[PDB]
Coordinates of all heavy atoms in Angstrom, one line a residue:
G52 N 0.9 -1.2 0.0 CA 0.0 0.0 0.0 C 0.9 1.2 0.0 O 2.1 1.1 -0.1
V53 N 0.3 2.4 0.0 CA 1.0 3.7 0.0 C 0.3 4.6 1.0 O -0.9 4.6 1.2 CB 0.9 4.3 -1.4 CG1 1.6 5.5 -1.4 CG2 1.5 3.3 -2.4
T54 N 1.1 5.3 1.8 CA 0.5 6.1 2.9 C -0.3 7.2 2.2 O 0.0 7.7 1.1 CB 1.6 6.7 3.8 OG1 2.5 7.5 3.1 CG2 2.3 5.6 4.6
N55 N -1.4 7.6 3.0 CA -2.3 8.7 2.5 C -1.8 10.0 3.1 O -0.8 10.2 3.6 CB -3.7 8.3 2.8 CG -4.0 8.2 4.3 OD1 -3.2 8.6 5.2 ND2 -5.1 7.6 4.7
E56 N -2.7 11.0 3.0 CA -2.4 12.4 3.5 C -2.2 12.5 5.0 O -1.5 13.4 5.4 CB -3.5 13.4 3.1 CG -3.4 13.9 1.7 CD -1.9 14.4 1.3 OE1 -1.4 15.2 2.1 OE2 -1.4 13.8 0.3
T57 N -2.7 11.5 5.7 CA -2.4 11.5 7.2 C -1.3 10.5 7.6 O -1.1 10.2 8.7 CB -3.7 11.1 7.9 OG1 -4.1 9.8 7.7 CG2 -4.9 11.9 7.4
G58 N -0.6 10.0 6.6 CA 0.6 9.1 6.8 C 0.2 7.7 7.2 O 0.9 7.0 7.8
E59 N -1.0 7.3 6.8 CA -1.6 6.0 7.3 C -2.0 5.1 6.1 O -2.0 5.6 4.9 CB -2.9 6.2 8.1 CG -2.5 7.1 9.4 CD -3.8 7.4 10.2 OE1 -4.9 6.8 9.9 OE2 -3.7 8.2 11.1
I60 N -2.3 3.9 6.3 CA -2.8 3.0 5.2 C -4.0 2.2 5.8 O -3.9 1.5 6.7 CB -1.7 2.0 4.7 CG1 -0.5 2.8 4.2 CG2 -2.3 1.2 3.6 CD1 0.7 1.9 3.8
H61 N -5.2 2.4 5.1 CA -6.3 1.7 5.5 C -6.3 0.3 4.9 O -5.9 0.2 3.8 CB -7.6 2.4 5.1 CG -7.8 3.7 5.8 ND1 -7.2 4.0 7.1 CD2 -8.4 4.9 5.5 CE1 -7.5 5.2 7.5 NE2 -8.2 5.8 6.5
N62 N -6.8 -0.7 5.6 CA -7.0 -2.1 5.1 C -5.7 -2.7 4.7 O -5.6 -3.3 3.7 CB -8.0 -2.1 4.0 CG -9.4 -1.6 4.5 OD1 -10.0 -0.8 3.7 ND2 -9.8 -2.0 5.7
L63 N -4.6 -2.4 5.4 CA -3.3 -2.8 5.1 C -3.3 -4.4 5.1 O -2.6 -5.0 4.3 CB -2.3 -2.3 6.0 CG -0.9 -2.6 5.7 CD1 -0.4 -2.2 4.3 CD2 -0.1 -2.0 6.9
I64 N -4.0 -5.0 6.0 CA -4.1 -6.4 6.1 C -5.4 -6.8 6.7 O -6.0 -6.1 7.6 CB -2.9 -7.0 6.9 CG1 -2.9 -8.5 6.8 CG2 -3.1 -6.7 8.4 CD1 -1.5 -9.1 6.7
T65 N -6.0 -8.0 6.3 CA -7.2 -8.4 6.9 C -6.9 -9.1 8.2 O -5.8 -9.7 8.4 CB -8.0 -9.4 6.0 OG1 -7.3 -10.6 5.8 CG2 -8.3 -8.7 4.7
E66 N -7.9 -9.2 9.1 CA -7.8 -10.0 10.3 C -7.5 -11.4 9.9 O -6.7 -12.1 10.6 CB -9.1 -9.9 11.1 CG -9.3 -8.5 11.8 CD -8.7 -8.4 13.2 OE1 -7.7 -9.2 13.5 OE2 -9.1 -7.5 14.0
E67 N -8.1 -11.9 8.8 CA -7.9 -13.3 8.5 C -6.5 -13.6 8.0 O -5.9 -14.7 8.3 CB -8.9 -13.7 7.4 CG -10.4 -13.3 7.7 CD -10.6 -11.8 7.5 OE1 -11.0 -11.4 6.4 OE2 -10.5 -11.0 8.5
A68 N -5.9 -12.7 7.3 CA -4.5 -13.0 6.8 C -3.5 -12.7 7.9 O -2.3 -13.2 7.7 CB -4.2 -12.1 5.5
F69 N -3.8 -12.0 8.9 CA -2.9 -11.5 9.9 C -2.9 -12.5 11.1 O -3.6 -12.4 12.1 CB -3.2 -10.1 10.4 CG -2.2 -9.5 11.3 CD1 -0.9 -9.3 10.9 CD2 -2.5 -9.1 12.6 CE1 0.1 -8.7 11.7 CE2 -1.6 -8.5 13.4 CZ -0.3 -8.3 13.0
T70 N -2.1 -13.6 10.9 CA -2.0 -14.7 11.9 C -0.7 -14.6 12.6 O 0.2 -13.8 12.3 CB -2.1 -16.0 11.1 OG1 -1.1 -16.2 10.1 CG2 -3.5 -16.1 10.4
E71 N -0.5 -15.5 13.6 CA 0.7 -15.5 14.4 C 1.9 -15.8 13.5 O 1.9 -16.6 12.7 CB 0.6 -16.6 15.5 CG 1.6 -16.5 16.5 CD 3.0 -17.1 16.1 OE1 3.0 -18.0 15.2 OE2 4.0 -16.7 16.7
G72 N 3.0 -15.0 13.8 CA 4.2 -15.2 13.1 C 5.1 -14.0 13.1 O 4.9 -13.1 13.9
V73 N 6.2 -14.1 12.3 CA 7.1 -13.0 12.2 C 6.9 -12.2 11.0 O 6.8 -12.7 9.9 CB 8.6 -13.6 12.2 CG1 9.6 -12.5 12.2 CG2 8.8 -14.5 13.4
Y74 N 6.8 -10.9 11.2 CA 6.4 -9.9 10.2 C 7.5 -8.9 9.9 O 8.3 -8.5 10.8 CB 5.2 -9.1 10.6 CG 3.9 -10.0 10.5 CD1 3.6 -10.8 11.5 CD2 3.1 -10.0 9.3 CE1 2.4 -11.6 11.5 CE2 2.0 -10.8 9.3 CZ 1.7 -11.6 10.3 OH 0.5 -12.4 10.3
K75 N 7.6 -8.5 8.6 CA 8.5 -7.4 8.2 C 7.6 -6.3 7.6 O 6.9 -6.6 6.6 CB 9.6 -7.9 7.3 CG 10.4 -6.7 6.7 CD 11.2 -7.0 5.5 CE 12.4 -7.8 5.7 NZ 12.8 -8.3 4.3
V76 N 7.7 -5.1 8.1 CA 7.0 -4.0 7.4 C 8.1 -3.1 6.8 O 9.0 -2.6 7.5 CB 6.1 -3.2 8.4 CG1 5.4 -2.0 7.6 CG2 5.1 -4.2 9.1
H77 N 8.0 -3.0 5.5 CA 9.1 -2.3 4.7 C 8.6 -1.0 4.1 O 7.6 -0.9 3.4 CB 9.4 -3.3 3.5 CG 10.3 -2.7 2.5 ND1 11.7 -2.9 2.6 CD2 10.1 -2.1 1.3 CE1 12.3 -2.3 1.6 NE2 11.4 -1.8 0.8
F78 N 9.3 0.1 4.4 CA 8.9 1.4 4.0 C 10.0 2.0 3.0 O 11.2 2.0 3.4 CB 8.9 2.4 5.2 CG 7.9 2.0 6.3 CD1 8.3 1.1 7.3 CD2 6.7 2.7 6.3 CE1 7.4 0.8 8.4 CE2 5.8 2.4 7.4 CZ 6.1 1.5 8.4
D79 N 9.5 2.4 1.9 CA 10.5 2.9 0.9 C 10.6 4.4 1.2 O 10.0 5.3 0.6 CB 10.0 2.7 -0.6 CG 11.0 3.4 -1.6 OD1 12.0 3.9 -1.2 OD2 10.7 3.3 -2.8
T80 N 11.5 4.7 2.2 CA 11.8 6.1 2.6 C 12.7 6.8 1.6 O 12.7 8.1 1.5 CB 12.4 6.1 4.0 OG1 13.6 5.3 3.9 CG2 11.5 5.4 5.0
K81 N 13.4 6.0 0.8 CA 14.3 6.7 -0.2 C 13.6 7.5 -1.2 O 13.9 8.6 -1.5 CB 15.2 5.6 -0.8 CG 16.2 6.2 -1.8 CD 17.0 5.0 -2.4 CE 18.1 5.4 -3.2 NZ 18.9 4.2 -3.7
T82 N 12.5 6.8 -1.8 CA 11.8 7.5 -2.9 C 11.0 8.7 -2.2 O 10.9 9.8 -2.9 CB 10.8 6.6 -3.5 OG1 11.5 5.5 -4.1 CG2 10.0 7.3 -4.6
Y83 N 10.6 8.6 -1.0 CA 10.0 9.8 -0.3 C 10.9 11.0 -0.3 O 10.5 12.1 -0.7 CB 9.5 9.4 1.1 CG 8.9 10.5 1.8 CD1 7.6 10.9 1.6 CD2 9.6 11.2 2.8 CE1 7.0 12.0 2.2 CE2 9.0 12.3 3.4 CZ 7.7 12.7 3.1 OH 7.1 13.8 3.8
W84 N 12.1 10.8 0.2 CA 13.0 12.0 0.2 C 13.4 12.5 -1.2 O 13.4 13.7 -1.4 CB 14.3 11.7 1.0 CG 13.9 11.5 2.5 CD1 14.1 10.4 3.2 CD2 13.3 12.5 3.3 NE1 13.6 10.6 4.5 CE2 13.2 11.8 4.6 CE3 12.9 13.8 3.2 CZ2 12.6 12.5 5.7 CZ3 12.4 14.5 4.3 CH2 12.2 13.8 5.5
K85 N 13.5 11.6 -2.1 CA 13.8 12.1 -3.5 C 12.7 12.9 -4.1 O 12.9 13.9 -4.8 CB 14.1 10.9 -4.4 CG 15.5 10.3 -4.1 CD 16.1 9.5 -5.2 CE 17.5 9.0 -4.7 NZ 18.0 8.1 -5.8
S86 N 11.4 12.6 -3.7 CA 10.3 13.3 -4.2 C 10.2 14.7 -3.6 O 9.6 15.6 -4.2 CB 9.0 12.6 -3.8 OG 8.6 12.8 -2.5
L87 N 11.0 15.0 -2.5 CA 11.1 16.3 -1.9 C 12.3 17.0 -2.3 O 12.5 18.2 -1.9 CB 11.0 16.2 -0.3 CG 9.7 15.5 0.2 CD1 9.9 15.5 1.7 CD2 8.5 16.3 -0.2
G88 N 13.2 16.4 -3.0 CA 14.4 17.0 -3.4 C 15.5 17.0 -2.4 O 16.4 17.8 -2.4
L89 N 15.4 16.1 -1.4 CA 16.4 16.0 -0.3 C 17.1 14.7 -0.5 O 16.6 13.7 -1.0 CB 15.7 16.1 1.1 CG 15.0 17.4 1.4 CD1 14.2 17.3 2.7 CD2 16.0 18.6 1.4
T90 N 18.4 14.7 -0.1 CA 19.2 13.5 -0.3 C 18.9 12.5 0.8 O 19.1 12.8 2.0 CB 20.6 14.0 -0.2 OG1 20.9 14.9 -1.3 CG2 21.6 12.8 -0.2

């Protein structure tokens, strides 16, 4: 998903798919700063 204007993502995962285990949440911060012209 992609964050919205409040920096959030609705319906990122359903209750059914979100089961016990190990999770990785990955944020592409690099493209965000390039979009602002900052290194």
Side-chain angles (χ1 to χ4, degrees):
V53 183
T54 57
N55 65 14
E56 277 311 304
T57 72
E59 300 176 10
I60 300 173
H61 296 333
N62 301 137
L63 183 58
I64 190 144
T65 65
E66 289 271 21
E67 312 76 89
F69 187 58
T70 58
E71 192 281 334
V73 182
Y74 288 82
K75 175 198 286 162
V76 180
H77 172 89
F78 299 83
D79 178 3
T80 59
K81 179 181 187 177
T82 301
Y83 178 80
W84 292 115
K85 287 199 179 175
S86 84
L87 298 182
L89 296 171
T90 295

